[PDB]
Amino acid sequence: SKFLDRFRYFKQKGETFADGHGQLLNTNRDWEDGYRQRWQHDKIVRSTHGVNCTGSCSWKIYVKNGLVTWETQQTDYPRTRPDLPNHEPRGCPRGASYSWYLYSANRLKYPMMRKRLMKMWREAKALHSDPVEAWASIIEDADKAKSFKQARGRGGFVRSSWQEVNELIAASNVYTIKNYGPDRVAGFSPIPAMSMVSYASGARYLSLIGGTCLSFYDWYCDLPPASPQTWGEQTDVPESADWYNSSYIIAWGSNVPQTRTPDAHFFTEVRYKGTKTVAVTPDYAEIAKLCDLWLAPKQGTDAAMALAMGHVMLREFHLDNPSQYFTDYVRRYTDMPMLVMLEERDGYYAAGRMLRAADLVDALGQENNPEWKTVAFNTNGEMVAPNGSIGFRWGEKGKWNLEQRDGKTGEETELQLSLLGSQDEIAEVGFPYFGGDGTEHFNKVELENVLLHKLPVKRLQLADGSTALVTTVYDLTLANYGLERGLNDVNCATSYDDVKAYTPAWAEQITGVSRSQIIRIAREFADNADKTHGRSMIIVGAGLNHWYHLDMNYRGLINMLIFCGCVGQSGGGWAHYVGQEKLRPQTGWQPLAFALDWQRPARHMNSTSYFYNHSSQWRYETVTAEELLSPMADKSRYTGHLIDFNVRAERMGWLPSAPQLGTNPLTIAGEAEKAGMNPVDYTVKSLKEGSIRFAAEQPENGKNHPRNLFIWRSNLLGSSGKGHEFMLKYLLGTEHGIQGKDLGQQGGVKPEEVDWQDNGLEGKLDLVVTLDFRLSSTCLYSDIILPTATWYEKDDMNTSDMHPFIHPLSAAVDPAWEAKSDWEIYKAIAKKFSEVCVGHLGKETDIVTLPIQHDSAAELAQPLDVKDWKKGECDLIPGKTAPHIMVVERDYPATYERFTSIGPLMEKIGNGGKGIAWNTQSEMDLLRKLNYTKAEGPAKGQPMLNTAIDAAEMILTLAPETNGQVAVKAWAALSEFTGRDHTHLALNKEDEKIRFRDIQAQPRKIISSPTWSGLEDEHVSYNAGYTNVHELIPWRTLSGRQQLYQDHQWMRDFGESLLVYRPPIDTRSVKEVIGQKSNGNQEKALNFLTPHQKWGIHSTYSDNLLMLTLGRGGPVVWLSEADAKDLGIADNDWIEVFNSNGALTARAVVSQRVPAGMTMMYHAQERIVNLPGSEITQQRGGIHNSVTRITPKPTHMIGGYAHLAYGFNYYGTVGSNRDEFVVVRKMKNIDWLDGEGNDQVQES
Amino acid sequence: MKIRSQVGMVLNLDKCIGCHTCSVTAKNVWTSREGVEYAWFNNVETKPGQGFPTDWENQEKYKGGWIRKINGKLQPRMGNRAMLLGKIFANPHLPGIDDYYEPFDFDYQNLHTAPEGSKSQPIARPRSLITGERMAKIEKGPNWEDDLGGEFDKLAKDKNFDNIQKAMYSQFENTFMMYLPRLCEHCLNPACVATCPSGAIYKREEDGIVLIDQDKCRGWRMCITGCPYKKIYFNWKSGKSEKCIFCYPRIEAGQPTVCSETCVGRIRYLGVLLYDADAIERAASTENEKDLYQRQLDVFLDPNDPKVIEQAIKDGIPLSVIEAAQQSPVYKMAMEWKLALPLHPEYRTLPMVWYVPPLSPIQSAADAGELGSNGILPDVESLRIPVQYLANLLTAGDTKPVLRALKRMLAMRHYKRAETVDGKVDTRALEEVGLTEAQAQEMYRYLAIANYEDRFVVPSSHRELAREAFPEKNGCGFTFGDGCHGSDTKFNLFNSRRIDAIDVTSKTE
Amino acid sequence: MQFLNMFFFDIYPYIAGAVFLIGSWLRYDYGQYTWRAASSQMLDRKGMNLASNLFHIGILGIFVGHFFGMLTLPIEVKQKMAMFAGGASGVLCLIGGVLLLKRRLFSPRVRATTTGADILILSLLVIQCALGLLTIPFSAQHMDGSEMMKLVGWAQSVVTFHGGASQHLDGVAFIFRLHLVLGMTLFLLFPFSRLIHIWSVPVEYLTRKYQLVRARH
């Protein structure tokens, strides 16, 4: 009895202590069980997060009372070497809050459908027993179609059932495919590495039926085009543990503590080993807190600082006191010694294309692909075609390597770098200079648009009898940097203080960073690299990569690393981290995701061109190609709207298309038959004649737009979608907040390749279907919302660029309410489709266009210039001057049996990627045993793909990263090309086979694979480019080396054959609207930056109460104190940010760490929480992408050219966004537009 | 002399990345209930700032901690025993819900249920978790000042700027910020225990964790004022107070706290400290507040000293606890290397959660600078965080121990760079700060590599000692409601018996 | 009337008394977590300092008065003290109480988080205190303490279990009857309201050593 215990008062007194200051008591403490019983739980399950953070962290999911209650990090990753910190615990704050979603008030529990669409669907079914015809009756009635498209984002969702929505979805897909074409059906899902099977689910269904799979890396602007330009690689970088092997690190535009949270300790800890660190960010960012020095260049001007640093480096470590390590490194691993041909101009010369073996008389003894092999001089003044150029990759074998050897005699050679001191004469070459251009918001430095430099040249006698002047990439590079070499070049610097084409004094003006800092750090960095043989590294992120001229910021950082021999050495190099792009077991996953086990090829599309086109953002373009050309280019040969350059790129097979042709591609074969020709030929003839046209030419004619769109693992309409208001108007057909006039309304110049119409087609999408676990902004604007399983309710796999482990997502409990995993949702759709299509689609024949692919022999397309067959400049040759034209048979009724079995092509054809292929029979045999096989039907005898686990096991068994047997066959295939053995890279692990159940017990390190260029080894960490440098495997570029010189016609004409400073672009989005809708408060134009947020991963977790409570309770925008004070804004005041593209409402965060002139609305806060109505649009306030708009760049459209050839997520236009400016002002009326009568007015 | 043990904690601020993961896991586990939804047992503040609750460091305002009277005696700043009771009907210093923030939620269901034909896009507005009413605007939150969120003149009211010429720090180029994660200090001389009229708060003997007994607390709410770190939060629903419990359910079996094991930055260390409980009052009442730090170090005993070992045993400290104390990372950082310092020792509570101060990028200067004593690496005098600010935070204003800590960390870096880049031995920086090479290498092992087994050396709390573990193993957890737990007397009005006990006595002796 | 009289003054006081005690014991043994003062101060500090102190200092004066007055200076001197000292305390109490009640009912944060019992018990003490003060003019009609003698006679018969206690009340003014019943009712409701905090007046604190440590147990 507790009452009776009170009487033992005296009895429970023990000894006093500390001279009477204390008393020890012997009393009951049973109450302590109250907190013990909270901690106790039922079990813990291993899982992870399928979100785009790069974290890839394994967690312990605690189930208590039969419900998921919280999570804590797993700490059992395989430990790293003794001299390196281990990875545990990883984790981040967004991840720690995921459990909140399972039973929260925003969880999606049941399939939902817009009420108006449901009422019509049911009324249509009462009149049309066949669901395809019921869908026809609604969609072909303009009034019916419009009544549900205008209801999008306007309430009225009603509970439906899996049966009802699956039938509608299937009926609509059949109708669309039958009447317009398979490519009018599309799907958008990103980053498969965060949840492989979950991505594969929709991609596989779409691929089987012919629908388009939209890309994401380029669209999100995570793809750095500079990587494919320099290395012929999408992205490959060192792992975070490798930062610990570096002795000098610059974090440049990368907010490590905030955006690479679970890996940040490698950066803080390596400092204790004596590594110096430098932060380069315009604001006082979190990353500055961890470095030894904070440099703050004006945002957008980083390339200028990088050029000046490179200048110092070349001056001091290449010229004045030649570094043995650096010199030998650039001689062997760059295109510096390669020869460039000079073009005659009026009184001077311009750098032309690189000299090819084919240009010389004997073609240098080169019989195979001589026009694709580059040329250098050896140290004995003789010409040579060295091993490794792209011409040696195809049509022959054993010479595609970086052995410094003569491509004809096979003898060892030594390349000479500079002609200086052996030139026949000095020629003057003009270099473009854009540093004097720019807007009023950035400092400029006037010199001349063309800068003349004296280059040492050598005249050569060409094969066609003509003669020509050549110089090396090296010499051209030193001139471009402005290094005086004794020829008394007036445009070369006489000192670092000489304001010239590109000095420390020059950069100080452009960037505002003190020239002595530029000099001191360039020096320290190069010295460190010289001493350690390359252990200097630069970690770089979206702070630099999301600018329109991202390529110049990157090539500047990249040249610094190259000149110091850091790329390819553990502890050194280019460390680009953005989204989670590294799905390690790539070739095991690709066949599953795009049904390549059944049909080849699939329909990949590059999303930036896709949305620029279909959401009609081109109808508002303000940037012209003309204003981006080199001052040395023939302006007349580059006329047209930016969209015209895309259409041309498409018809030349450079970039993919979607929809592809203006006619239903399921009908072409039938017509070819009647005309007496095979489909390919009939298509080419029709294309030459114009009876068949590329759909891109007429995007608004009613048959060339996408009609059904699947969205999953994406919040496209609240996060990533640049030009939000354009998507609402043109794709959705709903009210929108665009403020400006289009090309037509301003009487501007119409495109020359695309039809124009004054009243643009709106509401193009007939059906928007979104799969999610929370009601996101995208769900809010969809027609059908399907409840999906959270990451703690399904099995899947996850990998990342940051570490080498593969680990799983697992179901701690079955999905709650009526939710289903993505895999099960698409399997059920595939199943209903299969029956609904009977009688409408059978065994069909599809004509599919495929662009020329990087890593295929076809990459050797147009060697010396650009010829447009439509201009009659050449014949239409699919696969060379136009896209390949492929025939694909589809068995529509068998879609489900196919989706659920591993197809016969793996056995018939085999597997492969990155230009190599291998036999995979033994794996298919293993798979029949692990997954069991179909007992009957179309796929009888094939391994099954019924569960997500069967799908994961297929990924693991097929990939070389997870199956040592495959790894050895893959390295063997590569060895054929290089003539060097690489199998030794995986022999020691040939017996390794990673299994799904084993990774649930402990995450497993993957195996060294040719798919990648770094090693998974116990003595050296993973470092990108390590195999090129150490195994002599070439980079997949024209020259086989790191390419400093971009000689493609378009690269030359757009002024980017060599890196150069390019000021931020003018989007011209503010001057036409500022002051037009005054609310009485002052307005001011500011640079609108959107770095990634601390309280969410993109928009995921943005609605999470934990994150909202630790942040500022909803959408906010940061402003400097000076700008806020100028505008009368106090901390937390409601403000409105707007421009031509649209408007957004938010609260201000006022701060000293934001420099005057810029504002930061951290990347994505989206549209569902705490947003009042806009005074500009009189609609709900918009989001950050309500003020952006897609503007493509031509250089990112280049195809058919070795390293500049297409690949899904490998190349294509990018969704850059940092150059944007907006008008900012304090709001006055705060109306919530909800009929609650709870509105406010902000005074003054 | 009475030896007691406790698992202490050291947080290396130099490595803190200000991510708050520690705060989210702690909240999910311990304070997601109505009544404490606004309470963050572990919370992280960005400095300069006033923190949570606002200006909690201002003791003239909040009356937390101890004062040393003129006669040499200790008294809670709140008042002596009668002064305290005289304030019981309405604690005049009590922080109100607004000094923390009004907890809020959002109407997400409106996104799901909005009616067809809505004039505008539906949205989820804020609602108070105290009243259930619509909030026109969210005006505050627990981490409102995160990353210098707010005007400098507002953030600079930070009590730690006392005695500092602070204007220069409002200039963009001189900007600085750091992170201060905090939890309860589980003090040797806790002010909360001393200020609770019902005696419901106690320090556990075997492991020093300080708890508020949920049976015995009566809700007098004076402890909240008494705690100078403002780490006791009133549960507005139950009417009782609650605080960080140092995850005793895990510590009891030798596991790290949740906020420690989940620390992404790998900055937290857990290790045993042996202390002389009889010396507590003497140290906490030393006359000069600048001596409290060293006087506390003096109460910590050397675990490898056989005199201490024999006394510990005599005083009941379990052998595995003595052994863990001998490999304690906390003892190395606070006693040997002198890197860890207490948080606000001047409150006189003898805090048991210490901090290694952070390094920072160098200050703005006329040029790129020169090589200093540390070559291309920084010299302590060039760091941009004013050392006096750190000293106000950790050493009662004395910069000497703060400078020694930073300098030593910088010396380790210089020595290691000589080794790993130059491939040479250079102990010059070490010699300057009094470190030996063996010490520097050990500092590097613990701070840099920081293997899991080295960050957490937590022994068991030995629940079997002086108790009956066997019947408890067999019957704990069947919570049918026997009504007999919590008291020592067996008599009970419901005429029941404890489920986890043995009531049939052995008659064979 | 005579029936109601023996019920309320001979029977009812024992019902209330038994419930008060065994309810207090049972809630103490089985309801420790519910045993608290239930402060609402943090939710709304406004006016609490004045109101709670007025209320408590007032009600405690009366408690001392009532206790030593009816359960232990000629009688008329005690009556004089009761009216002046007690009256003044009652005024402080009533002001405090009314302020607390207005707060509990109309301060949104307090009203949103109150229990029904908190409103009920406070409302009844405000009535009881108003009733108490209202008896002053009646006692005034009998300055020789004759009324007080009746009331104390009844109180003392009740606490010593002498039957017939209601006889002592013969002819006392009705208002005293109401005050006695509401007062006893307060005891009956006591173990089921926040009033249990009263049992816990922290007297031990005045002599307790500052630091407390609990041994393994």
Ligand SMILES: Nc1nc2c(c(=O)[nH]1)N[C@@H](/C(S)=C(/S)[C@H](O)COP(=O)(O)OP(=O)(O)OC[C@H]1O[C@@H](n3cnc4c(=O)[nH]c(N)nc43)[C@H](O)[C@@H]1O)C=N2
């Ligand atoms: N917590 C969290 N983590 C995530 C994500 C998230 O949403 N949340 N998302 C992922 C993804 S998908 C990406 S693409 C990255 O995180 C982006 O982060 P990063 O730090 O590279 O970019 P960011 O665009 O944020 O820019 C980093 C910082 O650079 C500064 N900055 C901004 N503009 C510039 C500039 O022009 N030049 C220079 N030198 N710096 C600039 C700024 O301090 C910014 O925070 C990554 N992990």
Ligand SMILES: Oc1c(Cl)c(Cl)c(Cl)c(Cl)c1Cl
């Ligand atoms: O309230 C009282 C006071 Cl104050 C005195 Cl003095 C006496 Cl005697 C009695 Cl009976 C009551 Cl009730």
Ligand code: SF4
């Ligand atoms: S959200 Fe990403 S970084 Fe954060 S814990 Fe999850 S996987 Fe790790």
Ligand code: SF4
């Ligand atoms: S998790 Fe660790 S690094 Fe992150 S805020 Fe908390 S203490 Fe600092």
Ligand SMILES: [Mo+6]
């Ligand atoms: Mo990204």
